[PDB]
Structure 1
Amino acid sequence: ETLNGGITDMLTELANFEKNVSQAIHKYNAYRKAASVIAKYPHKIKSGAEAKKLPGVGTKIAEKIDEFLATGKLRKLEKIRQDDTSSSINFLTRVSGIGPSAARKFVDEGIKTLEDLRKNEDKLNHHQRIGLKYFGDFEKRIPREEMLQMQDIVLNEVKKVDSEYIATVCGSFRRGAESSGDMDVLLTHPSFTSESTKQPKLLHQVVEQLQKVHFITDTLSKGETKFMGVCQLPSKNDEKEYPHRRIDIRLIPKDQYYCGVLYFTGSDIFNKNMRAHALEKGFTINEYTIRPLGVTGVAGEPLPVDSEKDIFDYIQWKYREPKDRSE
């Protein structure tokens, strides 16, 4: 956590670089288990060999470990950090919709800067166009203060359309959080569950309304179950317009709401821990259900959930307010 800190960080730097700048999924996977492992190790790594003994740590890494322990640096790390090319990829990748793949290609073509990206909007597909358009707004944290006004808005229309729609804004926002990166609204309806062959309109109506009033301004991707767009709160009585925010809305079979909800509520650790817990308690939990465990090694049979509670109850725990799902 702090004892093998640089070690893993240097490790993680390395990996990432292979994966993105290079297209070396192996080396990249190398740097990772190694970083994974040295990280679990209970003692101050004193040298390559010491590390070396580790599963996954080879002569390659161990070698880097020395130079890094010997001098507070690494050449490769220094050279890479310098490398205009790899820098460039590191950056373009920031655009919503630009993966490494396209970052390399763009670069190859010679698009390195944002401005480059601009003179060639054409080479860009819609997602990246929008991604480019709101590049500034996408990088900004969402003040909870607005989260409240946005949630306010969603809920309302949602209800306005059908009164049967149930919506929840998940994420850190739900868990207290002072700010968040984007909003996640999970959604379901009663007319839609595991069997009952869809109702694409379900999602559509809603999105339609949102847009109708101008809360949603763009569409990144809209499918029959997952809409991914852009919203913005009414820029009041001028002098102050609001930043463009990312929003995600997803239809959910009423029969798996809470699990989903439980899940996307996090935290990443609370979950795991919760998850690790159902296990002893004779269960199993995943994003959509909670099945009682059987001795044969495994077992099925999706227990019925009406609220976040049932899940708790099942696993027999103290209902934990979102606020304290912190870990």
Structure 2
Amino acid sequence: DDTSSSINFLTRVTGIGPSAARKLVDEGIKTLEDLRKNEDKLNHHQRIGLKYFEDFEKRIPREEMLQMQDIVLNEVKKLDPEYIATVCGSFRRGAESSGDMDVLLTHPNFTSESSKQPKLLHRVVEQLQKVRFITDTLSKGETKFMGVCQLPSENEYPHRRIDIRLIPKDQYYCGVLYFTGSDIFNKNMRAHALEKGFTINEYTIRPLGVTGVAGEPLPVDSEQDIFDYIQWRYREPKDRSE
């Protein structure tokens, strides 16, 4: 009803999951002004999403992505030019507008064998904060950061959603591929690989076998490699709609 209508609303709130939404409905919380009057029952993630509720409903136009992407690439490079960072999302595909920003990061010192290097990701976050680009943090893991950013004002820009993920170097390309999309694309590509005797996921490419349940990840130094393995002409992100 006009009240379910209320669960529908809350849930627009980043951080506000159903279960999560439901309870707040049981507390008498339904509108947003409700929410603001009740910051104390929301977690850190939900507060922030509440705080930028509107801004978050706004799309990001390419022009801004471009600048955002430059700020990020640039800071990273100063920290250690050995780091590799790529912005995925339809944006990499050439998209005219975006909803948020996705940066996949990596570094040769961090391979799927190490597994334990928070500092590599935190140091970038720190730098991005110290430069005034990232303005807030929703949550921050050892391998993933989710927060808020804003383009520097000269005089203002809405706050945007930014995610930065640290992936091991030996699995970075499957990830970039993976997060670049599109969805169909991945699908048709995974389908084909199979016909070629390979199984791909967001982390590896592995040859099949008898009965099927087979494996052992093939070395991948670029996105190009995955296309070679299945012997398909390379496809520039822009041609990845399907």
Could you tell me how far apart the structure 2 residues matched to 1:315 and 1:291 are? 11
Could you tell me how far apart the structure 1 residues matched to 2:154 and 2:169 are? 36
Residue by residue over 1:237-275, the C-alpha shift from the partner in whole angstroms, topping out at 9 and shown as x without a partner, is 3xxx11000000001100001000000000000000000
Q: Identity over the aligned pairs, expressed in percent? A: 95
Say which is worse superposed, 102-111 or 168-177, in terms of deviation.
102-111
Residue by residue over 1:37-59, the C-alpha shift from the partner in whole angstroms, topping out at 9 and shown as x without a partner, is xxxxxxxxxxxxxxxxxxxxxxx
Decide which of 197, 217, 235 is 1:302's aligned counterpart.
217
Give the gaps of 5 or more residues in structure 2. Answer: none
C-alpha deviation, 1:101, in angstroms: 1.0
1:91 match? 9
Could you tell me how far apart the structure 1 residues matched to 2:53 and 2:28 are? 20
1:207 match? 125
C-alpha deviation, 1:289, in angstroms: 0.5
Could you tell me how far apart the structure 1 residues matched to 2:226 and 2:109 are? 22
- Is 1:291 aligned to residue 206 of structure 2? yes
Q: Secondary structure at the match of 1:186?
A: strand
Say which is worse superposed, 270-279 or 193-202, in terms of deviation.
193-202
Could you tell me how far apart the structure 2 residues matched to 1:155 and 1:122 are? 37
Q: Secondary structure at the match of 2:103?
A: strand
2:192 match? 277
For the structure 1 residues 197 and 87, does the alpha-carbon distance in structure 2 shift closer, same or farther, using more than 3 Å as the test?
closer
C-alpha deviation, 1:228, in angstroms: 0.5
Could you tell me how far apart the structure 2 residues matched to 1:293 and 1:127 are? 41
C-alpha deviation, 1:236, in angstroms: 1.8
C-alpha deviation, 1:295, in angstroms: 2.1
- Name the count of aligned residue pairs: 242
Residue by residue over 1:288-320, the C-alpha shift from the partner in whole angstroms, topping out at 9 and shown as x without a partner, is 000011123221111011111000000100111
Relative to the length of structure 2, the TM-score reads 0.98
Decide which of 100, 114, 123 is 2:41's aligned counterpart.
123
C-alpha deviation, 1:148, in angstroms: 0.1
C-alpha deviation, 1:284, in angstroms: 0.4
Residue by residue over 1:139-165, the C-alpha shift from the partner in whole angstroms, topping out at 9 and shown as x without a partner, is 111111100000010000000101110
Residue by residue over 1:124-151, the C-alpha shift from the partner in whole angstroms, topping out at 9 and shown as x without a partner, is 1111110110000111111111000000
Could you tell me how far apart the structure 2 residues matched to 1:204 and 1:221 are? 12
Residue by residue over 1:95-145, the C-alpha shift from the partner in whole angstroms, topping out at 9 and shown as x without a partner, is 111111121111221111111111111111111110110000111111111
Q: Secondary structure at the match of 1:135?
A: coil
Larger Rg: 1
1:24 match? none
Could you tell me how far apart the structure 2 residues matched to 1:298 and 1:97 are? 37
Greater relative contact order (Cα < 8 A, sep 6+): 2
Q: Secondary structure at the match of 1:173?
A: helix
- Is 1:177 aligned to residue 85 of structure 2? no
Could you tell me how far apart the structure 1 residues matched to 2:4 and 2:162 are? 30
C-alpha deviation, 1:194, in angstroms: 1.1
Say which is worse superposed, 173-182 or 117-126, in terms of deviation.
117-126
C-alpha deviation, 1:84, in angstroms: 1.7
Could you tell me how far apart the structure 2 residues matched to 1:192 and 1:251 are? 9
**Structure 1 or 2: larger helix share?**
1
C-alpha deviation, 1:85, in angstroms: 1.4
For the structure 1 residues 197 and 132, does the alpha-carbon distance in structure 2 shift closer, same or farther, using more than 3 Å as the test?
closer
Could you tell me how far apart the structure 2 residues matched to 1:182 and 1:223 are? 19
C-alpha deviation, 1:324, in angstroms: 1.0
Q: Secondary structure at the match of 1:221?
A: strand
- Is 1:254 aligned to residue 169 of structure 2? yes
Q: Secondary structure at the match of 1:172?
A: helix
Could you tell me how far apart the structure 1 residues matched to 2:23 and 2:92 are? 39
Could you tell me how far apart the structure 2 residues matched to 1:297 and 1:160 are? 46
Give the gaps of 5 or more residues in structure 1. Answer: 1-82
Say which is worse superposed, 262-271 or 93-102, in terms of deviation.
93-102
C-alpha deviation, 1:197, in angstroms: 3.8
Decide which of 12, 17, 22 is 1:104's aligned counterpart.
22
C-alpha deviation, 1:196, in angstroms: 2.1
Runs of 4+ in structure 1 deviating by more than 4 angstroms, as ranges, are none
Could you tell me how far apart the structure 2 residues matched to 1:233 and 1:299 are? 47
